[PDB]
Design an enzyme around this catalytic site. Structure first.
Site, mmCIF file in Angstrom:
data_model
loop_
_atom_site.group_PDB
_atom_site.id
_atom_site.type_symbol
_atom_site.label_atom_id
_atom_site.label_comp_id
_atom_site.label_asym_id
_atom_site.label_seq_id
_atom_site.Cartn_x
_atom_site.Cartn_y
_atom_site.Cartn_z
ATOM 1 N N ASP A 1 -17.867 51.341 -11.121
ATOM 2 C CA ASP A 1 -17.006 50.550 -10.322
ATOM 3 C C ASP A 1 -16.648 51.202 -9.013
ATOM 4 O O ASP A 1 -16.374 50.459 -8.072
ATOM 5 C CB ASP A 1 -15.759 50.225 -11.181
ATOM 6 C CG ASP A 1 -16.063 49.746 -12.609
ATOM 7 O OD1 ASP A 1 -17.179 49.357 -12.919
ATOM 8 O OD2 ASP A 1 -15.205 49.784 -13.473
ATOM 9 N N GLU B 1 -15.648 55.019 -13.686
ATOM 10 C CA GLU B 1 -15.482 53.717 -14.308
ATOM 11 C C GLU B 1 -14.027 53.343 -14.040
ATOM 12 O O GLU B 1 -13.161 54.206 -13.883
ATOM 13 C CB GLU B 1 -15.724 53.800 -15.776
ATOM 14 C CG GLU B 1 -17.063 53.210 -16.146
ATOM 15 C CD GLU B 1 -16.950 51.693 -16.146
ATOM 16 O OE1 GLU B 1 -16.474 51.142 -17.134
ATOM 17 O OE2 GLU B 1 -17.318 51.048 -15.169
ATOM 18 N N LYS C 1 -10.782 50.673 -15.201
ATOM 19 C CA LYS C 1 -10.365 49.750 -16.244
ATOM 20 C C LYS C 1 -8.926 49.451 -15.966
ATOM 21 O O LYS C 1 -8.175 50.355 -15.560
ATOM 22 C CB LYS C 1 -10.491 50.415 -17.602
ATOM 23 C CG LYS C 1 -11.586 49.861 -18.486
ATOM 24 C CD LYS C 1 -12.964 50.065 -17.869
ATOM 25 C CE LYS C 1 -13.965 48.939 -18.187
ATOM 26 N NZ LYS C 1 -14.859 49.288 -19.279
#
Lengths: 154, 154
Positions: free
Chosen positions: B55, B65, B67
């Site tokens: 991401d 990453e 989240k």
């Protein structure tokens, strides 16, 4: 880390206020499903959005259809993905509100009466019969039509 | 005039300024795919979002990453709906940034290093074979695990 954080902090109280004003009007999340766009149509128009039949209702109980486009991205308003004479039977009864955004800002709002859309309703119905009773997947209404034929409320 | 319509006029300056900011950072529309929420994480953290892979990236080219969790609605971060050993392998290479929101406001951000999540990658890879090569639908990482194991950035 981005010095733009100063800016964020400067801005943030006003974003939360704008989101409190959306909650007041039935929009839980300004940053999801065009929530912050829709709040501008509801506040200029005075409408109240209806939950998942029609889409909006005014103070006097008049229901309306409400269609939006971002004109940078497109030039025709969508209608329904599987229309047939019964969707059209529903559509024949109410005025439609057409909101034109340019980016995140509303650029114009138009109102068309059922009499202004009989053109496409008759045509769509005919076409559902001539194509052997198959549902038309989302016919579109050109922006130029709605701007030729409607009342500009904004 | 109109009391709420006065508020649109008073607030919209700052919404436009927050969208300009988001363009500088590659979010095209704050009102659409939580773009106004993600901007908060990128200004605080100083990261750059990537398209399609992981991401985000810092200036040194380390990938992350990323989240998020609305703490009002759930208590576990999602992972991947089709968890399998190849997905896990990509995952073991990068730190994860977990951002915790309450409604539309960011409340906290933690970073866990792959060593802090090996726990789970193991259990998940073992299960895949033990339950006979059967992919895991979106395993969840408990918010308690991340408050206990990672670094709090914000």
């Amino acid at each position: 880390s981005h010095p733009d954080l100063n800016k964020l902090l400067e801005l943030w109280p006003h974003i939360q206020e704008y989101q409190d004003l959306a909650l007041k009007h039935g929009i839980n999340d300004i940053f999801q499903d065009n929530g912050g766009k829709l709040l501008q149509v509801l506040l200029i128009t005075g409408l109240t959005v209806l939950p998942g039949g029609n889409d909006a209702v005014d103070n006097a109980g008049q229901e309306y259809e409400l269609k939006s486009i971002n004109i940078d991205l497109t030039k025709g308003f969508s209608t329904h993905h599987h229309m047939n004479p019964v969707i059209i039977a529903k559509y024949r009864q109410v005025p439609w509100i057409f909101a034109i955004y340019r980016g995140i800002a509303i650029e114009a709002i138009y109102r068309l009466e059922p009499k202004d859309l009989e053109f496409y309703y008759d045509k769509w119905e005919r076409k559902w019969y001539s194509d052997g009773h198959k549902d038309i997947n989302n016919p579109k209404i050109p922006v130029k039509y709605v701007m030729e034929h409607g009342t500009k409320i904004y």
